[PDB]
Enzyme design. Sequence first.
Site, PDB file in Angstrom:
ATOM      1  N   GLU A  15      -0.416  -3.630   5.257  1.00 47.93           N
ATOM      2  CA  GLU A  15       0.847  -2.922   5.007  1.00 47.93           C
ATOM      3  C   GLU A  15       1.684  -3.521   3.860  1.00 47.93           C
ATOM      4  O   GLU A  15       2.909  -3.649   3.965  1.00 47.93           O
ATOM      5  CB  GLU A  15       1.681  -2.849   6.299  1.00 47.93           C
ATOM      6  CG  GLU A  15       0.893  -2.442   7.540  1.00 47.93           C
ATOM      7  CD  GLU A  15       1.764  -2.280   8.776  1.00 47.93           C
ATOM      8  OE1 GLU A  15       2.996  -2.479   8.672  1.00 47.93           O
ATOM      9  OE2 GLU A  15       1.215  -1.950   9.856  1.00 47.93           O
ATOM     10  N   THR A  20      -1.058   2.285  -1.738  1.00 45.85           N
ATOM     11  CA  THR A  20      -0.009   2.918  -2.525  1.00 45.85           C
ATOM     12  C   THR A  20      -0.235   2.677  -4.009  1.00 45.85           C
ATOM     13  O   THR A  20      -0.250   3.608  -4.807  1.00 45.85           O
ATOM     14  CB  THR A  20       1.370   2.364  -2.139  1.00 45.85           C
ATOM     15  OG1 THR A  20       1.488   2.318  -0.711  1.00 45.85           O
ATOM     16  CG2 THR A  20       2.474   3.235  -2.717  1.00 45.85           C
ATOM     17  N   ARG A 149       1.678   6.963   5.195  1.00 42.46           N
ATOM     18  CA  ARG A 149       1.002   5.756   5.689  1.00 42.46           C
ATOM     19  C   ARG A 149      -0.320   6.088   6.378  1.00 42.46           C
ATOM     20  O   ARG A 149      -0.334   6.832   7.353  1.00 42.46           O
ATOM     21  CB  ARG A 149       1.931   5.012   6.659  1.00 42.46           C
ATOM     22  CG  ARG A 149       1.283   3.909   7.486  1.00 42.46           C
ATOM     23  CD  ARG A 149       0.648   2.834   6.622  1.00 42.46           C
ATOM     24  NE  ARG A 149      -0.105   1.863   7.413  1.00 42.46           N
ATOM     25  CZ  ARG A 149      -0.906   0.929   6.903  1.00 42.46           C
ATOM     26  NH1 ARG A 149      -1.077   0.819   5.587  1.00 42.46           N
ATOM     27  NH2 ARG A 149      -1.546   0.098   7.713  1.00 42.46           N
ATOM     28  N   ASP A 171     -10.028  -1.274  -3.122  1.00 39.45           N
ATOM     29  CA  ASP A 171      -9.038  -1.361  -2.054  1.00 39.45           C
ATOM     30  C   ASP A 171      -9.731  -1.802  -0.780  1.00 39.45           C
ATOM     31  O   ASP A 171     -10.835  -1.350  -0.481  1.00 39.45           O
ATOM     32  CB  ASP A 171      -8.350  -0.009  -1.832  1.00 39.45           C
ATOM     33  CG  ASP A 171      -7.171  -0.092  -0.861  1.00 39.45           C
ATOM     34  OD1 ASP A 171      -6.801  -1.217  -0.459  1.00 39.45           O
ATOM     35  OD2 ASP A 171      -6.614   0.969  -0.499  1.00 39.45           O
ATOM     36  N   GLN A 175      -5.612  -6.206   7.451  1.00 32.71           N
ATOM     37  CA  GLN A 175      -5.522  -6.812   8.778  1.00 32.71           C
ATOM     38  C   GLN A 175      -6.596  -7.878   8.941  1.00 32.71           C
ATOM     39  O   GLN A 175      -7.591  -7.870   8.218  1.00 32.71           O
ATOM     40  CB  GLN A 175      -5.665  -5.760   9.880  1.00 32.71           C
ATOM     41  CG  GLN A 175      -4.451  -4.859  10.050  1.00 32.71           C
ATOM     42  CD  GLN A 175      -4.305  -3.839   8.938  1.00 32.71           C
ATOM     43  OE1 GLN A 175      -5.289  -3.425   8.327  1.00 32.71           O
ATOM     44  NE2 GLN A 175      -3.071  -3.432   8.668  1.00 32.71           N
TER      45      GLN A 175
HETATM   46  N1  LIG Z   1      10.122   1.050   0.465  1.00 36.72           N
HETATM   47  C1  LIG Z   1       8.903   0.705  -0.023  1.00 36.72           C
HETATM   48  N2  LIG Z   1       7.797   1.043   0.690  1.00 36.72           N
HETATM   49  C2  LIG Z   1       6.556   0.717   0.246  1.00 36.72           C
HETATM   50  C3  LIG Z   1       6.412  -0.002  -1.020  1.00 36.72           C
HETATM   51  N3  LIG Z   1       5.096  -0.188  -1.213  1.00 36.72           N
HETATM   52  C4  LIG Z   1       4.446   0.369  -0.163  1.00 36.72           C
HETATM   53  N4  LIG Z   1       5.326   0.905   0.708  1.00 36.72           N
HETATM   54  C5  LIG Z   1       5.036   1.613   1.981  1.00 36.72           C
HETATM   55  O1  LIG Z   1       4.548   0.730   2.997  1.00 36.72           O
HETATM   56  C6  LIG Z   1       3.505   1.379   3.724  1.00 36.72           C
HETATM   57  C7  LIG Z   1       2.221   0.569   3.570  1.00 36.72           C
HETATM   58  O2  LIG Z   1       1.629   0.809   2.293  1.00 36.72           O
HETATM   59  P1  LIG Z   1       0.036   0.788   2.096  1.00 36.72           P
HETATM   60  O3  LIG Z   1      -0.256   0.999   0.629  1.00 36.72           O
HETATM   61  O4  LIG Z   1      -0.583   1.715   3.119  1.00 36.72           O
HETATM   62  O5  LIG Z   1      -0.323  -0.740   2.499  1.00 36.72           O
HETATM   63  P2  LIG Z   1      -1.825  -1.347   2.546  1.00 36.72           P
HETATM   64  O6  LIG Z   1      -2.233  -1.315   4.002  1.00 36.72           O
HETATM   65  O7  LIG Z   1      -1.632  -2.743   2.010  1.00 36.72           O
HETATM   66  O8  LIG Z   1      -2.621  -0.430   1.649  1.00 36.72           O
HETATM   67  C8  LIG Z   1       3.381   2.795   3.169  1.00 36.72           C
HETATM   68  O9  LIG Z   1       4.095   3.731   3.984  1.00 36.72           O
HETATM   69  C9  LIG Z   1       3.991   2.702   1.789  1.00 36.72           C
HETATM   70  O10 LIG Z   1       4.566   3.930   1.348  1.00 36.72           O
HETATM   71  C10 LIG Z   1       7.661  -0.330  -1.736  1.00 36.72           C
HETATM   72  O11 LIG Z   1       7.630  -0.940  -2.824  1.00 36.72           O
HETATM   73  N5  LIG Z   1       8.830   0.041  -1.195  1.00 36.72           N
HETATM   74  F1  ALF Z   2      -3.415  -0.118   5.538  1.00 43.06           F
HETATM   75 AL1  ALF Z   2      -3.690  -1.818   5.031  1.00 43.06          AL
HETATM   76  F2  ALF Z   2      -3.931  -3.511   4.461  1.00 43.06           F
HETATM   77  F3  ALF Z   2      -2.587  -2.373   6.341  1.00 43.06           F
HETATM   78  F4  ALF Z   2      -4.755  -1.247   3.699  1.00 43.06           F
HETATM   79 MG   LIG Z   3      -4.234   0.412   2.845  1.00 37.14          MG
END
Ligand SMILES: Nc1nc2c(ncn2[C@@H]2O[C@H](COP(=O)(O)OP(=O)(O)O)[C@@H](O)[C@H]2O)c(=O)[nH]1
Ligand code: ALF
Ligand SMILES: [Mg+2]
Lengths: 318, 749
Positions: A15, A20, A149, A171, A175
Amino acid sequence: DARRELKLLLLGTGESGKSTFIKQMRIIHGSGYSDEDKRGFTKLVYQNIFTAMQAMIRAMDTLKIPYKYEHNKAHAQLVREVDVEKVSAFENPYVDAIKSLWNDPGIQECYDRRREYQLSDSTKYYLNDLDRVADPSYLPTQQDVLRVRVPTTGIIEYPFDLQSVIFRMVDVGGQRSERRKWIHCFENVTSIMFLVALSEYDQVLVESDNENRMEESKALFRTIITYPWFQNSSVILFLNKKDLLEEKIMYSHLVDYFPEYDGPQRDAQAAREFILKMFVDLNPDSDKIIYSHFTCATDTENIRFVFAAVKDTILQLN
Amino acid sequence: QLEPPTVVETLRRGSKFIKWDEETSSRNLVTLRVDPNGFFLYWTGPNMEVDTLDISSIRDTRTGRYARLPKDPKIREVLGDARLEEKLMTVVSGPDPVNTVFLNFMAVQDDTAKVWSEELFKLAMNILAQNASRNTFLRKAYTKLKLQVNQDGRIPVKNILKMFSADKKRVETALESCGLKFNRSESIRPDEFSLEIFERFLNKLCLRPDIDKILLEIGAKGKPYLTLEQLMDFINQKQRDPRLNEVLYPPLRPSQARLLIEKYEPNQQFLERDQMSMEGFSRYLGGEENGILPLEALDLSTDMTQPLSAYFINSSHNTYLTAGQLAGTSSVEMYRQALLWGCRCVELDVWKGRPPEEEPFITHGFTMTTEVPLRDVLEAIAETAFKTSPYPVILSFENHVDSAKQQAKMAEYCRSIFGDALLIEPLDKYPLAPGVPLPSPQDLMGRILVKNKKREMSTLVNYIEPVKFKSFEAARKRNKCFEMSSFVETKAMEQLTKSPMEFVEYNKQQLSRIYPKGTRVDSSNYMPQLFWNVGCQLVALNFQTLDVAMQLNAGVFEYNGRSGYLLKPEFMRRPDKSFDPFTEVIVDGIVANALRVKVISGQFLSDRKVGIYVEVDMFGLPVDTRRKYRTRTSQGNSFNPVWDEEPFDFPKVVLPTLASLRIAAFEEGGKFVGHRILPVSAIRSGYHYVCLRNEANQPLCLPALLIYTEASDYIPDDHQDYAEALINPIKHVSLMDQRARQLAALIGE
Ligand SMILES: Nc1nc2c(ncn2[C@@H]2O[C@H](COP(=O)(O)OP(=O)(O)O)[C@@H](O)[C@H]2O)c(=O)[nH]1
Ligand code: ALF
Ligand SMILES: [Mg+2]
Ligand SMILES: O=P(O)(O)O[C@@H]1[C@H](O)[C@H](O)[C@@H](OP(=O)(O)O)[C@H](OP(=O)(O)O)[C@H]1O
Ligand SMILES: [Ca+2]
């Protein structure tokens, strides 16, 4: 025809922005999102809204918060019996139910304590703008697609044909269970791109309710940069969610979660830099310059400014 | 919303049919029922003796036109054009496509057969029923006993002896300890034969020292009790698939574990304290939650929007033939049986009709085989094509009709008999141009696709034009996905060993059909995996021969809701990627896995005291394919053999999505008991019963195995320490920062 191909890694705790960021690549460099592609996300946005509300409804029991207005108990019972998996429409009575719940001071006070449970960081973004979503002809905006998300699992590669070079960005899931799979994308890696949620400094992991999220991201970064696969790899570090830091840092103090912080309270700039320092400073088993950047992955122009720079750094070193 | 099997009230209370017979002409007025759970179609016929049909064995239900009509005019005198045929029902059931029996009924009432036929089919093709829990199959046996009763309604002991015929002296002593009757000459009141009492009979019949061992293992040194948290930790740590996300697939909360105690534990003294016993635990092990597979796998939960060449497709070779190639029957039924079983490519060797009627017919290349007319075969396809799957059916022609009059006729026969389904022009989205992909299965749902040679039958061809394969270079030069090519087994093997990677790349855009060599005159099958490894979609096989090869085919195509289409792996579809199918080391981008199958025990595996052994084979890429493992043959025990065996390891599964585990039991001597194909990428971890199946993948009732699987993601030897730090970095970094801080004073400066 004869373009060189480099392979970047999006790594981070869960997360943090990885996916994104990939969307922003797809917008800026990739094919983008046609109106066809946006209708694919409509279901996802509906599900988000439920998930977020069901999370807050359970939190009213967990944190013991009274529903200000009586009739919302009935609405609360309506929304909590829904199986989010089977959601593909946002019609009444649920539209009015959730709107009525979101309006309740008890539900608002539960939102004010989202630190104490697992709630998404696009919840207010969606739950405030319910009228546009409830609309029966609704087509999600580009920002709606960015804010959505969808947890990632395994190893997905996305190539991007930039004029001079092609970036095979990989990507991955953030977790803990997912990090075991990471090794199967470690060969021939030009650069690691590490994302860190600046906002997570006072939050505990989903997979561990007693361990700090930044403490884990920090620790993960320190480990990952000193690996045999990344001797001849640059290390870009994206400190993401700067906007949420600016927002949060007013009420939640970094001193309370990282007692070796020396700067003042309610100052976002001082805190983001401390966190940058925490990640890169005093590292005996590291000797590579780290190109940090303060990002907000949901801000297309910020990422367009940021990544175009990271490109010029990567190509230079290759 | 994949709902569980529900028996409508019409089938519970029942309806009056007259069960007639083609052969002996036996007219018997009977009342058809279905038991509450939907296990058995039963009816009382001769004097007062109860017949049962096992619904899991039902292959088709037919009504109206498709109901078999009484040829004998003597029977038809007793019976009596349109509204007469409206109330006919033919149930087809059998252990394989070839050996099927027909049970013709006729209702007395109006438009009644259509409710039974349609509902019997719904039950017979239900997925949860086929993938029922171990306890449900045990409850199915309880039902069979309670159904098949003597003329005075009682459950005779000699059927309890027939069901458990292995050690009859044990079954007698089992029944006496319950307080039931144990003589072979007497019977039991249904009244007195409770499920709870049958449940206790099973217990005392077969000791579970294996489950006792598993209880000690987990923690309980004081074994007769178990805490809620203990169960939770066992379920979360040992019974959980570790390849899965902790957010998408959360661990068990204590409230959820409580609901499992209430669901299973009989003892109210344990239940009141939130605890579980051997009985409750044993009940859970074979429970609805603790399957070897998750539902997703079985459910139609695969993406169907990719181009048609991106899927493995269930295919038949010379579908019409029932046994042999050179000498044997040609049946229209096999087309029914093929398509009903999820086959999506059926073959038709059409031939030039004689001068009396000039009707095109089907048979083998002027061999010693019988014939069936084409008209009939098309009607059989029209009936069954999309009865079990809404996804396209490719018609693999082999036209030997060079007369223009019969060519236009058979094209009309195709047009008139199929109608709207028959795809006659290309779709608007996917023209027949260069650089265009094939349409998706989604896009072609409910469409018949003919595959016939060109230069009236040609104009029907569009998306599957067969062409004489020159080379993978020549195919790439053209870049036309609508073209395709068939390959005889040996020629496919040639391209496999010489140009494996160019084959995969070819299959990424276009289709390759593959059939067995002509020398397999006794309908012998080749291993289809051999060509699924290079992405070949239409790997055609002889459905009449249920050897290991067809067992696999039938087993793997079950998944994805018996659609017939299975989505290929990511790296066998994506243009930008590439890898060697003969790779002996893990590919970057593809998360390899490691498997640890261990055979613990098995119950009610054979109906006579004999030694039993169990094989554990894997089928995938050649590096993944390992099929030499085998347990030691048990010591003449069939009720409850317990193998004290070493784990069977599969330390490196390079491409797990392609990989398929096969678990099969055999009698001492080699006689087949039952098997199971489990997709490795889906298989669960920890202790699970593997309810065995017959060679045609029909669920057997009592023969089940207990196994212990471990299926985690692959970690090499040297990179074991590195992995641990990715999964839990705080621990590693915390020590390092402590060490350095312990050296604080000592450094100084
Ligand atoms: N407010 C805000 N939300 C963000 C930002 N970057 C990501 N998010 C949000 O946090 C959540 C997790 O992002 P995601 O890309 O799914 O995380 P991942 O699991 O690392 O790929 C999503 O709902 C995104 O829209 C940011 O810079 N600002
Ligand atoms: F949705 Al993730 F790391 F929490 F890609
Ligand atoms: Mg992700
Ligand atoms: O069934 P058998 O006896 O092995 O006969 C072959 C088989 O039916 C092939 O499917 C068929 O090619 P199609 O795929 O075109 O039907 C081939 O004809 P061909 O070599 O003239 O193509 C036959 O020789
Ligand atoms: Ca043929």
